[PDB]
Symmetry: C3
Subunit: 221 residues, 3 copies
């Protein structure tokens, strides 16, 4: 079942990527960069999850699905880039703020991998550092990055706020599931965690970009 | 023999690098970025192949020359950057298209490495995904990237087209040799593959940049 | 003792990061990019050294202990330090990102050769070490040659500050391959504990000290 779920995931990622490609051909004032980011996220995630489907992207240690970290270390910084460029749409870019989010995010995913390879107090030190990185990402998202969105007018700021809440709601689920599941306290069963880390990312990767791109395209007319 | 061939390769990479450095000192209207890229490619490849020469960049699994993938994951994106900047010479840059090629290319090399670590059907799934990435790179090369080159005038577009054909002809040999050799069907012997992955990259890395830089330098007024 | 020294280091990195964050809030004409670089360096190093303190960022190999977390640190922190140095030289003028990325490429290569040298035995070890030393020499040639000429093109006051920071960095950086060669990774003349203290104290000056001096000099160029 776990294999088939991962094949299904990879197929949905492929369909999302093709959809973003088709949108890219009639862009409606959205720059090519935002379509490229929207395509890379699902294609990379699809490849990583394909490796799990084939029985390759995991080892016994508990089962570490290390292919999830290979996925997230690329897909999650690109999602924050997508979010930052939404805030900056129609105005001057702040690439310093964007790379701040990328750095916090890459650190966050690495702490998750290290936490998974750790035992006891050490595991929760790494987990805690990752949670602190996420909190700072959310502070940037609803603080300075939202103020950039407000500077780009009512309609953009409304769209940004919707996508920021969408992303934030989904992202806080990941460390929650991780702590509850086999990598953490072991309250939730492996199969439950597998379904959560199939369904969440479908919304985090394809859903997010459908909402993000549709809202930006609508600003054209 | 395999060790000595890799020492030879690394020496040729060093000579290429020094040649590009000397050209960089009298640049003839070619930006410093294109000289930097031309130098990094052979120096990085030379270091990776030095590790094989020293008996370090390989393990038994059949022999996986993993240092080739360490080489290509850096050298091949830089070659496509060189190709993209050639198309954009004298005009506005399209870094979105450039990073599209980089992303496709890094994926391509990773699928190769995973294919090498895989057995049976799994191996050919990864190989096929890599080949699909290469096809998209070639579609971009002869489609949108070539239209950028045409927008920069007859002489630039003529040079771009020659370099694009040069690169494309060499690059399709890599997945061909891979499939024929020990990582794939195992029709070609290890030593045969070693010579192919010595001679191809000499043309792919030093040859390519000699041709690319010479054509760009020739566009120079005064 | 080794564990406690690493906890201490990580705490000092955290304090440096906080100081640079506070400076960033009253920037005095220094772009946000230079404050971000100044913060990432110590935070990343602090994380890497935290892993050593927890007993994780090290393994036994050739009977010696390889502190592999040091290379994970340096491969990110050292290119960012040269970026900080290059942006100092370019302060008030046109950026040369080609020269900046030249330093980044040399530097990443340098750290990788160090790691490979540490995993190597005999002549092979010293081939890798030598390639890293050649990379450092070229970095220092760029630092005092073309990069210094960019700094001089940005006027007396900037060039004076650049030269001070270039000497500061260069003096500290030549110590790393010197300690490496003397210590357990090289000739084994210096003891593990001695090397540990050197690779605690040097980086405190290389990462926090450097950026205090660098940022203070740039901030002082500001009028208000
Ligand atoms: C194993 C492989 C590891 C790979 C290692 C990766 C190295 C990470 C650092 C990169 C250099 C950072 C470069 C900084 C970019 C230039 C900044 C710039 O342009 O600044 C503009 C201005 O200052 C704003 O106002
Ligand atoms: C593990 C794989 C990591 C791959 C990293 C990528 C390798 C480095 C190549 C980057 C592409 C270079 C792009 C240069 C842009 C030049 C644009 C300009 O000159 O304005
Ligand atoms: C592992 C070693 C390789 C690491 C990356 C090396 C980067 C090589 C390519 C960089 C090209 C950057 C050129 C930027 C051009 C901008 C124009 C300028 O200001 O000079
Ligand atoms: C592909 C693109 C990125 C995703 C890939 C990463 C996971 C690859 C896992 C390879 C493990 C193979 C080893 C084995 O066969 O046991
Ligand atoms: C571990 C390696 C981390 C890899 C991270 C890859 C993605 C990171 C950042 C993407 C930033 C894209 C910048 C967009 C510029 C916007 C524009 O100019 O249109
Ligand atoms: C964990 C490791 C992550 C490394 C991240 C490195 C960040 C450092 C430098 C990025 C600075 C970007 C400068 C852009 C200037 C233009 C602008 O602000 O719009
Ligand atoms: C979830 C927990 C953390 C989220 C905190 C968000 C705080 C946003 C700051 C708003 C502001 O700076 O005005
Ligand atoms: C609807 C069905 C939900 C089934 C259970 C939901 C998750 C609870 C935790 C667990 O199953 O480990
Ligand atoms: C499983 C199939 C993919 C799931 C994706 C959808 C997530 C929710 C998207 C909601 C917004 C779509 C409508 C719109 O914004 O115009
Ligand atoms: C490697 C990951 C690929 C995705 C990266 C982000 C795209 C960056 C494009 C920058 C846009 C600059 C404007 C332009 O010249 O097109
Ligand atoms: C490590 C990072 C690897 C990135 C993920 C690999 C897959 C990404 C490929 C994206 C390519 C899509 C480009 C199509 C757009 C081109 C165009 O419209 O001209
Ligand atoms: C669409 C493009 C895909 C092209 C890829 C070619 C796959 C090559 C076939 C693999 C050989 C399998 C032989 C075997 O398993 O014995
Ligand atoms: C997902 C990626 C899908 C398709 C990438 C297509 C690349 C660009 C094709 C342009 C064709 C042309 O104009 O000649
Ligand atoms: C960011 C800082 C990263 C540090 C890497 C630490 C790696 C430790 C792996 C766990 C080792 C173990 O528990 O055996
Ligand atoms: C620098 C360029 C990259 C070099 C390739 C990596 C070399 C492999 C190092 C592992 C050696 C281990 C051993 O000595 O057995
Ligand atoms: C010992 C350190 C070795 C290198 C010292 C640096 C020498 C710099 C000379 C270049 C200056 C110039 O180009 O005029
Ligand atoms: C599953 C994802 C497939 C593509 C989604 C297209 C939905 C279009 C919304 C209008
Ligand atoms: C690069 C992403 C690969 C996804 C396509 C492969 C998965 C398809 C599953 C259906 C069988
Ligand atoms: C064995 C594991 C193979 C992993 C290959 C892909 C990892 C590189 C992607 C960038 C983080
Ligand atoms: C651990 C490596 C990552 C560290 C990144 C540092 C993040 C700094 C955040 C600065 C944001 C400034 C807010 C402006 C208002
Ligand atoms: C068995 C002990 C488990 C402790 C879990 C600790 C994680 C708490 C959540 C992170 C908070 C970080 C600081 C804010
Ligand atoms: C002023 C910048 C100095 C760059 C010189 C190095 C470039 C040539 C290629 C590397 C050869 C290494 C030998 C030392 C010279
Ligand atoms: C075991 C040793 C592995 C080799 C270390 C070199 C890695 C170089 C970086 C590769 C990614 C670009
Ligand atoms: C055995 C030592 C390590 C082998 C794996 C090195 C990873 C290099 C792969 C680069 C990405 C294609
Ligand atoms: C110029 C063309 C270069 C192509 C190289 C082909 C290598 C063939 C080697 C055969 C080994 C027996
Ligand atoms: C080190 C301190 C970094 C804290 C980041 C705070 C986020 C910005 C708030 C506006
Ligand atoms: C056991 C060995 C695993 C160590 C993992 C370390 C975390 C990855 C850090 C990535 C740094 C790359 C520059
Ligand atoms: C065990 C080794 C884990 C990775 C080592 C980090 C390599 C650093 C490259 C400079
Ligand atoms: C085991 C004895 C070998 C000693 C060689 C050490 C010398 C290495 C080369 C030094 C490069 C300049 C510093
Ligand atoms: C005016 C030319 C500059 C020469 C710089 C001298 C070399 C500095 C040595 C650094 C080591 C500390
Ligand atoms: C760019 C700075 C490089 C610093 C190199 C450190 C020099 C240490 C001693 C020189 C090498 C002597 C070799 C002794 C070999 C004994 C057998
Ligand atoms: Na966006
Ligand atoms: Na070129
Ligand atoms: Na600086």
């Amino acid at each position: 079942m776990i294999s088939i779920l991962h094949y299904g995931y990879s197929f949905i990622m492929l369909l999302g990527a093709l959809y973003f490609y088709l949108l890219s051909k009639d862009p409606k004032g959205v720059p090519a960069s935002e379509y490229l980011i929207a395509m890379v996220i699902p294609l990379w995630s699809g490849a990583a999850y394909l490796s799990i489907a084939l029985g390759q992207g995991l080892f016994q240690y508990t089962t570490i699905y290390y292919a999830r970290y290979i996925d997230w270390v690329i897909s999650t910084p690109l999602l924050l880039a997508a979010l930052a460029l939404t805030a900056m749409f129609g105005g001057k870019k702040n690439l310093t703020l964007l790379f701040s989010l990328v750095a916090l995010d890459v650190f966050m995913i690495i702490t998750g991998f290290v936490a998974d390879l750790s035992i006891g107090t050490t595991k929760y030190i790494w987990y805690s550092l990752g949670v602190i990185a996420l909190i700072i990402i959310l502070v940037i998202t609803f603080g300075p990055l939202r103020r950039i969105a407000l500077s780009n007018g009512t309609r953009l700021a409304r769209h940004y706020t919707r996508v920021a809440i969408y992303l934030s709601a989904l992202w806080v689920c990941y460390p929650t599931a991780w702590l509850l599941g086999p990598s953490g306290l072991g309250l939730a069963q492996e199969l439950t965690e597998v379904l959560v880390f199939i369904i969440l990312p479908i919304f985090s990767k394809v859903g997010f970009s459908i909402v993000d791109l549709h809202g930006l395209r609508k600003l054209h007319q």
